[PDB]
mmCIF file of N, CA and C in Angstrom:
data_model
loop_
_atom_site.group_PDB
_atom_site.id
_atom_site.type_symbol
_atom_site.label_atom_id
_atom_site.label_comp_id
_atom_site.label_asym_id
_atom_site.label_seq_id
_atom_site.Cartn_x
_atom_site.Cartn_y
_atom_site.Cartn_z
ATOM 1 N N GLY A 1 0.826 -1.196 0.000
ATOM 2 C CA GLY A 1 0.000 0.000 0.000
ATOM 3 C C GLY A 1 0.858 1.243 0.000
ATOM 4 N N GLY A 2 0.227 2.385 -0.223
ATOM 5 C CA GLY A 2 0.947 3.631 -0.236
ATOM 6 C C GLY A 2 0.045 4.755 -0.663
ATOM 7 N N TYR A 3 0.618 5.941 -0.779
ATOM 8 C CA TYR A 3 -0.137 7.088 -1.234
ATOM 9 C C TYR A 3 0.764 8.097 -1.916
ATOM 10 N N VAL A 4 0.144 8.915 -2.754
ATOM 11 C CA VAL A 4 0.763 10.119 -3.286
ATOM 12 C C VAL A 4 -0.125 11.321 -2.961
ATOM 13 N N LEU A 5 0.520 12.478 -2.812
ATOM 14 C CA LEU A 5 -0.147 13.766 -2.666
ATOM 15 C C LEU A 5 0.502 14.730 -3.630
ATOM 16 N N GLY A 6 -0.299 15.541 -4.316
ATOM 17 C CA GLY A 6 0.244 16.423 -5.334
ATOM 18 C C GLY A 6 -0.450 17.762 -5.415
ATOM 19 N N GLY B 1 -5.585 16.642 -2.973
ATOM 20 C CA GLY B 1 -5.572 15.661 -4.045
ATOM 21 C C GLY B 1 -4.403 14.699 -3.965
ATOM 22 N N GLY B 2 -4.546 13.551 -4.624
ATOM 23 C CA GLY B 2 -3.643 12.444 -4.427
ATOM 24 C C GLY B 2 -4.273 11.126 -4.798
ATOM 25 N N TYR B 3 -3.723 10.058 -4.236
ATOM 26 C CA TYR B 3 -4.212 8.715 -4.491
ATOM 27 C C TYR B 3 -3.745 7.817 -3.360
ATOM 28 N N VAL B 4 -4.580 6.853 -2.983
ATOM 29 C CA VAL B 4 -4.250 5.896 -1.938
ATOM 30 C C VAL B 4 -4.495 4.480 -2.429
ATOM 31 N N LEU B 5 -3.554 3.587 -2.134
ATOM 32 C CA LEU B 5 -3.748 2.144 -2.227
ATOM 33 C C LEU B 5 -3.631 1.572 -0.821
ATOM 34 N N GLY B 6 -4.657 0.853 -0.377
ATOM 35 C CA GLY B 6 -4.611 0.171 0.902
ATOM 36 C C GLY B 6 -5.011 -1.296 0.829
ATOM 37 N N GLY C 1 -11.632 1.065 11.909
ATOM 38 C CA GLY C 1 -10.510 1.440 11.077
ATOM 39 C C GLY C 1 -11.001 2.290 9.928
ATOM 40 N N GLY C 2 -10.067 2.861 9.183
ATOM 41 C CA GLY C 2 -10.448 3.648 8.037
ATOM 42 C C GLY C 2 -9.271 4.390 7.456
ATOM 43 N N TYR C 3 -9.555 5.176 6.432
ATOM 44 C CA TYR C 3 -8.535 5.951 5.739
ATOM 45 C C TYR C 3 -9.214 7.089 4.993
ATOM 46 N N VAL C 4 -8.533 8.229 4.905
ATOM 47 C CA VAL C 4 -9.071 9.413 4.238
ATOM 48 C C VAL C 4 -8.040 9.984 3.276
ATOM 49 N N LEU C 5 -8.513 10.408 2.106
ATOM 50 C CA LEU C 5 -7.741 11.214 1.167
ATOM 51 C C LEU C 5 -8.492 12.525 0.947
ATOM 52 N N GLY C 6 -7.810 13.656 1.120
ATOM 53 C CA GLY C 6 -8.410 14.958 0.870
ATOM 54 C C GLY C 6 -7.550 15.893 0.042
ATOM 55 N N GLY D 1 -10.874 12.995 -3.812
ATOM 56 C CA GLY D 1 -10.775 12.590 -2.423
ATOM 57 C C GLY D 1 -11.751 11.472 -2.130
ATOM 58 N N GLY D 2 -11.657 10.907 -0.935
ATOM 59 C CA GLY D 2 -12.523 9.811 -0.567
ATOM 60 C C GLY D 2 -12.155 9.269 0.793
ATOM 61 N N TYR D 3 -12.950 8.322 1.277
ATOM 62 C CA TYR D 3 -12.622 7.662 2.529
ATOM 63 C C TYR D 3 -13.162 6.239 2.530
ATOM 64 N N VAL D 4 -12.572 5.418 3.390
ATOM 65 C CA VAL D 4 -13.137 4.123 3.752
ATOM 66 C C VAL D 4 -13.252 4.026 5.263
ATOM 67 N N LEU D 5 -14.219 3.236 5.708
ATOM 68 C CA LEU D 5 -14.350 2.824 7.098
ATOM 69 C C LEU D 5 -14.515 1.320 7.145
ATOM 70 N N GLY D 6 -13.907 0.686 8.141
ATOM 71 C CA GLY D 6 -14.033 -0.753 8.310
ATOM 72 C C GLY D 6 -14.109 -1.185 9.753
ATOM 73 N N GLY E 1 -8.087 -8.714 -0.367
ATOM 74 C CA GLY E 1 -8.913 -7.518 -0.367
ATOM 75 C C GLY E 1 -8.054 -6.275 -0.367
ATOM 76 N N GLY E 2 -8.686 -5.134 -0.590
ATOM 77 C CA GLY E 2 -7.966 -3.888 -0.602
ATOM 78 C C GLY E 2 -8.868 -2.764 -1.030
ATOM 79 N N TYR E 3 -8.294 -1.577 -1.145
ATOM 80 C CA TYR E 3 -9.049 -0.430 -1.601
ATOM 81 C C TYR E 3 -8.148 0.578 -2.282
ATOM 82 N N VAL E 4 -8.768 1.396 -3.121
ATOM 83 C CA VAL E 4 -8.150 2.600 -3.652
ATOM 84 C C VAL E 4 -9.037 3.803 -3.328
ATOM 85 N N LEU E 5 -8.392 4.960 -3.179
ATOM 86 C CA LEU E 5 -9.059 6.248 -3.032
ATOM 87 C C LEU E 5 -8.411 7.211 -3.997
ATOM 88 N N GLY E 6 -9.211 8.022 -4.682
ATOM 89 C CA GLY E 6 -8.669 8.904 -5.701
ATOM 90 C C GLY E 6 -9.363 10.244 -5.782
ATOM 91 N N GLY F 1 -1.961 20.514 -3.446
ATOM 92 C CA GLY F 1 -1.863 20.109 -2.056
ATOM 93 C C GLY F 1 -2.839 18.991 -1.763
ATOM 94 N N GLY F 2 -2.745 18.425 -0.568
ATOM 95 C CA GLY F 2 -3.610 17.330 -0.201
ATOM 96 C C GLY F 2 -3.242 16.788 1.160
ATOM 97 N N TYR F 3 -4.037 15.840 1.644
ATOM 98 C CA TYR F 3 -3.709 15.181 2.895
ATOM 99 C C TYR F 3 -4.249 13.757 2.897
ATOM 100 N N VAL F 4 -3.659 12.937 3.756
ATOM 101 C CA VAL F 4 -4.224 11.642 4.118
ATOM 102 C C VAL F 4 -4.339 11.544 5.630
ATOM 103 N N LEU F 5 -5.306 10.754 6.075
ATOM 104 C CA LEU F 5 -5.438 10.343 7.465
ATOM 105 C C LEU F 5 -5.602 8.838 7.511
ATOM 106 N N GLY F 6 -4.995 8.204 8.508
ATOM 107 C CA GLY F 6 -5.120 6.765 8.677
ATOM 108 C C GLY F 6 -5.196 6.333 10.120
ATOM 109 N N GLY G 1 -15.290 -0.735 12.990
ATOM 110 C CA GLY G 1 -16.115 0.461 12.990
ATOM 111 C C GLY G 1 -15.257 1.705 12.990
ATOM 112 N N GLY G 2 -15.889 2.846 12.767
ATOM 113 C CA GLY G 2 -15.169 4.092 12.754
ATOM 114 C C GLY G 2 -16.070 5.216 12.327
ATOM 115 N N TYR G 3 -15.497 6.403 12.211
ATOM 116 C CA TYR G 3 -16.252 7.550 11.756
ATOM 117 C C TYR G 3 -15.351 8.558 11.074
ATOM 118 N N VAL G 4 -15.971 9.376 10.236
ATOM 119 C CA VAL G 4 -15.352 10.580 9.704
ATOM 120 C C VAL G 4 -16.240 11.783 10.028
ATOM 121 N N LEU G 5 -15.595 12.939 10.177
ATOM 122 C CA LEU G 5 -16.262 14.227 10.324
ATOM 123 C C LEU G 5 -15.614 15.191 9.360
ATOM 124 N N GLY G 6 -16.414 16.002 8.674
ATOM 125 C CA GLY G 6 -15.871 16.884 7.656
ATOM 126 C C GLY G 6 -16.566 18.224 7.575
ATOM 127 N N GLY H 1 -12.788 24.622 10.383
ATOM 128 C CA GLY H 1 -12.775 23.641 9.311
ATOM 129 C C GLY H 1 -11.606 22.679 9.392
ATOM 130 N N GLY H 2 -11.749 21.531 8.732
ATOM 131 C CA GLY H 2 -10.846 20.424 8.929
ATOM 132 C C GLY H 2 -11.476 19.106 8.558
ATOM 133 N N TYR H 3 -10.926 18.038 9.120
ATOM 134 C CA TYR H 3 -11.414 16.695 8.865
ATOM 135 C C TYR H 3 -10.948 15.797 9.996
ATOM 136 N N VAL H 4 -11.783 14.833 10.373
ATOM 137 C CA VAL H 4 -11.453 13.876 11.418
ATOM 138 C C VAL H 4 -11.698 12.460 10.928
ATOM 139 N N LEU H 5 -10.757 11.567 11.223
ATOM 140 C CA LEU H 5 -10.951 10.124 11.129
ATOM 141 C C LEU H 5 -10.834 9.551 12.536
ATOM 142 N N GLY H 6 -11.860 8.833 12.979
ATOM 143 C CA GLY H 6 -11.814 8.151 14.258
ATOM 144 C C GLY H 6 -12.214 6.684 14.185
ATOM 145 N N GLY I 1 -6.377 6.784 13.356
ATOM 146 C CA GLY I 1 -7.203 7.980 13.356
ATOM 147 C C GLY I 1 -6.345 9.223 13.356
ATOM 148 N N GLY I 2 -6.976 10.365 13.133
ATOM 149 C CA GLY I 2 -6.256 11.611 13.121
ATOM 150 C C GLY I 2 -7.158 12.735 12.693
ATOM 151 N N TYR I 3 -6.585 13.921 12.578
ATOM 152 C CA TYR I 3 -7.340 15.068 12.122
ATOM 153 C C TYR I 3 -6.438 16.077 11.441
ATOM 154 N N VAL I 4 -7.059 16.895 10.602
ATOM 155 C CA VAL I 4 -6.440 18.099 10.071
ATOM 156 C C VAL I 4 -7.328 19.301 10.395
ATOM 157 N N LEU I 5 -6.682 20.458 10.544
ATOM 158 C CA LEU I 5 -7.350 21.746 10.691
ATOM 159 C C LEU I 5 -6.701 22.709 9.726
ATOM 160 N N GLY I 6 -7.501 23.521 9.041
ATOM 161 C CA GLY I 6 -6.959 24.403 8.022
ATOM 162 C C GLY I 6 -7.653 25.742 7.941
ATOM 163 N N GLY J 1 -3.876 32.140 10.750
ATOM 164 C CA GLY J 1 -3.862 31.159 9.678
ATOM 165 C C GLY J 1 -2.693 30.198 9.758
ATOM 166 N N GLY J 2 -2.836 29.049 9.099
ATOM 167 C CA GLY J 2 -1.933 27.943 9.296
ATOM 168 C C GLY J 2 -2.564 26.625 8.925
ATOM 169 N N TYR J 3 -2.013 25.556 9.487
ATOM 170 C CA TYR J 3 -2.502 24.214 9.232
ATOM 171 C C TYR J 3 -2.036 23.316 10.363
ATOM 172 N N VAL J 4 -2.870 22.351 10.740
ATOM 173 C CA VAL J 4 -2.540 21.394 11.785
ATOM 174 C C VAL J 4 -2.785 19.979 11.294
ATOM 175 N N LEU J 5 -1.845 19.085 11.589
ATOM 176 C CA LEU J 5 -2.039 17.642 11.496
ATOM 177 C C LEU J 5 -1.921 17.070 12.902
ATOM 178 N N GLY J 6 -2.947 16.351 13.346
ATOM 179 C CA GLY J 6 -2.901 15.670 14.625
ATOM 180 C C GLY J 6 -3.301 14.203 14.552
ATOM 181 N N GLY K 1 -9.164 28.494 9.911
ATOM 182 C CA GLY K 1 -9.065 28.088 11.300
ATOM 183 C C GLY K 1 -10.041 26.970 11.593
ATOM 184 N N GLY K 2 -9.947 26.405 12.788
ATOM 185 C CA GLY K 2 -10.813 25.309 13.156
ATOM 186 C C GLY K 2 -10.445 24.768 14.516
ATOM 187 N N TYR K 3 -11.240 23.820 15.000
ATOM 188 C CA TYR K 3 -10.912 23.161 16.252
ATOM 189 C C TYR K 3 -11.452 21.737 16.253
ATOM 190 N N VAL K 4 -10.862 20.917 17.113
ATOM 191 C CA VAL K 4 -11.427 19.622 17.475
ATOM 192 C C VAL K 4 -11.542 19.524 18.986
ATOM 193 N N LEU K 5 -12.509 18.734 19.431
ATOM 194 C CA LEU K 5 -12.640 18.322 20.821
ATOM 195 C C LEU K 5 -12.805 16.818 20.868
ATOM 196 N N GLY K 6 -12.198 16.184 21.864
ATOM 197 C CA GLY K 6 -12.323 14.745 22.033
ATOM 198 C C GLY K 6 -12.399 14.313 23.476
ATOM 199 N N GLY L 1 -18.835 9.045 25.265
ATOM 200 C CA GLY L 1 -17.712 9.420 24.433
ATOM 201 C C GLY L 1 -18.204 10.270 23.285
ATOM 202 N N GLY L 2 -17.270 10.841 22.539
ATOM 203 C CA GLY L 2 -17.650 11.628 21.393
ATOM 204 C C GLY L 2 -16.474 12.370 20.812
ATOM 205 N N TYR L 3 -16.758 13.156 19.788
ATOM 206 C CA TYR L 3 -15.738 13.931 19.095
ATOM 207 C C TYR L 3 -16.417 15.069 18.349
ATOM 208 N N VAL L 4 -15.736 16.208 18.262
ATOM 209 C CA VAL L 4 -16.274 17.393 17.594
ATOM 210 C C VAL L 4 -15.243 17.964 16.633
ATOM 211 N N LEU L 5 -15.716 18.387 15.462
ATOM 212 C CA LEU L 5 -14.944 19.194 14.523
ATOM 213 C C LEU L 5 -15.695 20.505 14.303
ATOM 214 N N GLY L 6 -15.013 21.636 14.477
ATOM 215 C CA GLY L 6 -15.613 22.938 14.227
ATOM 216 C C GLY L 6 -14.752 23.872 13.399
ATOM 217 N N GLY M 1 -18.077 20.975 9.544
ATOM 218 C CA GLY M 1 -17.978 20.570 10.934
ATOM 219 C C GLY M 1 -18.954 19.452 11.227
ATOM 220 N N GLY M 2 -18.860 18.887 12.421
ATOM 221 C CA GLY M 2 -19.726 17.791 12.789
ATOM 222 C C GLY M 2 -19.357 17.249 14.149
ATOM 223 N N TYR M 3 -20.153 16.302 14.633
ATOM 224 C CA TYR M 3 -19.825 15.642 15.885
ATOM 225 C C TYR M 3 -20.364 14.218 15.887
ATOM 226 N N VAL M 4 -19.774 13.398 16.746
ATOM 227 C CA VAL M 4 -20.340 12.103 17.108
ATOM 228 C C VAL M 4 -20.455 12.006 18.620
ATOM 229 N N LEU M 5 -21.421 11.215 19.064
ATOM 230 C CA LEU M 5 -21.553 10.804 20.455
ATOM 231 C C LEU M 5 -21.718 9.300 20.501
ATOM 232 N N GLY M 6 -21.110 8.666 21.498
ATOM 233 C CA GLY M 6 -21.236 7.227 21.667
ATOM 234 C C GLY M 6 -21.311 6.795 23.110
ATOM 235 N N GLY N 1 -9.922 16.563 25.632
ATOM 236 C CA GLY N 1 -8.800 16.938 24.800
ATOM 237 C C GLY N 1 -9.292 17.788 23.651
ATOM 238 N N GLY N 2 -8.358 18.359 22.906
ATOM 239 C CA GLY N 2 -8.738 19.146 21.760
ATOM 240 C C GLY N 2 -7.561 19.889 21.179
ATOM 241 N N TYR N 3 -7.846 20.674 20.155
ATOM 242 C CA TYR N 3 -6.825 21.449 19.462
ATOM 243 C C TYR N 3 -7.505 22.587 18.716
ATOM 244 N N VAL N 4 -6.824 23.727 18.628
ATOM 245 C CA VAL N 4 -7.361 24.912 17.961
ATOM 246 C C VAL N 4 -6.331 25.483 16.999
ATOM 247 N N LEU N 5 -6.803 25.906 15.829
ATOM 248 C CA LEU N 5 -6.031 26.713 14.890
ATOM 249 C C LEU N 5 -6.782 28.023 14.670
ATOM 250 N N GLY N 6 -6.100 29.155 14.843
ATOM 251 C CA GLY N 6 -6.701 30.456 14.593
ATOM 252 C C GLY N 6 -5.840 31.391 13.765
ATOM 253 N N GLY O 1 -2.720 8.583 12.275
ATOM 254 C CA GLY O 1 -1.597 8.958 11.443
ATOM 255 C C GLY O 1 -2.089 9.808 10.295
ATOM 256 N N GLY O 2 -1.155 10.379 9.549
ATOM 257 C CA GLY O 2 -1.535 11.167 8.404
ATOM 258 C C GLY O 2 -0.359 11.909 7.823
ATOM 259 N N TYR O 3 -0.643 12.694 6.798
ATOM 260 C CA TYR O 3 0.378 13.469 6.106
ATOM 261 C C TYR O 3 -0.302 14.607 5.359
ATOM 262 N N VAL O 4 0.379 15.747 5.272
ATOM 263 C CA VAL O 4 -0.158 16.932 4.604
ATOM 264 C C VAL O 4 0.872 17.503 3.643
ATOM 265 N N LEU O 5 0.400 17.926 2.473
ATOM 266 C CA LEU O 5 1.171 18.733 1.533
ATOM 267 C C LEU O 5 0.421 20.043 1.313
ATOM 268 N N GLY O 6 1.103 21.175 1.487
ATOM 269 C CA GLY O 6 0.502 22.476 1.237
ATOM 270 C C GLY O 6 1.363 23.411 0.409
ATOM 271 N N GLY P 1 3.327 24.161 -2.606
ATOM 272 C CA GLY P 1 3.341 23.179 -3.678
ATOM 273 C C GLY P 1 4.510 22.218 -3.598
ATOM 274 N N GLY P 2 4.367 21.070 -4.257
ATOM 275 C CA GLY P 2 5.270 19.963 -4.060
ATOM 276 C C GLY P 2 4.639 18.645 -4.431
ATOM 277 N N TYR P 3 5.190 17.577 -3.870
ATOM 278 C CA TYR P 3 4.701 16.234 -4.125
ATOM 279 C C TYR P 3 5.167 15.336 -2.994
ATOM 280 N N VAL P 4 4.333 14.372 -2.616
ATOM 281 C CA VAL P 4 4.663 13.414 -1.571
ATOM 282 C C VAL P 4 4.417 11.999 -2.062
ATOM 283 N N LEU P 5 5.358 11.105 -1.767
ATOM 284 C CA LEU P 5 5.164 9.662 -1.860
ATOM 285 C C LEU P 5 5.281 9.090 -0.454
ATOM 286 N N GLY P 6 4.256 8.371 -0.011
ATOM 287 C CA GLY P 6 4.302 7.690 1.268
ATOM 288 C C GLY P 6 3.902 6.223 1.196
#
């Protein structure tokens, strides 16, 4: 799992 | 804004 | 449990 | 955006 | 199982 | 910008 | 179980 | 204003 | 769990 | 003004 | 601005 | 118990 | 904003 | 408990 | 837990 | 502004 923010 | 995988 | 993206 | 609860 | 949020 | 909570 | 507030 | 996950 | 304030 | 993560 | 109570 | 966001 | 009670 | 941003 | 980008 | 991978 993981995430990005932009 | 972003994206998540869990 | 839970998760949030904003 | 979005959320989950479990 | 799993989830995505976008 | 954005955020996550877990 | 859980909750969100927004 | 804000957001809560509990 | 957690929170943001903005 | 500002921002908080807790 | 904002606040939480718990 | 409880929680508040304002 | 919002609240929960339990 | 709680937290404030102003 | 969480993370913020601003 | 920026970008985050978590």
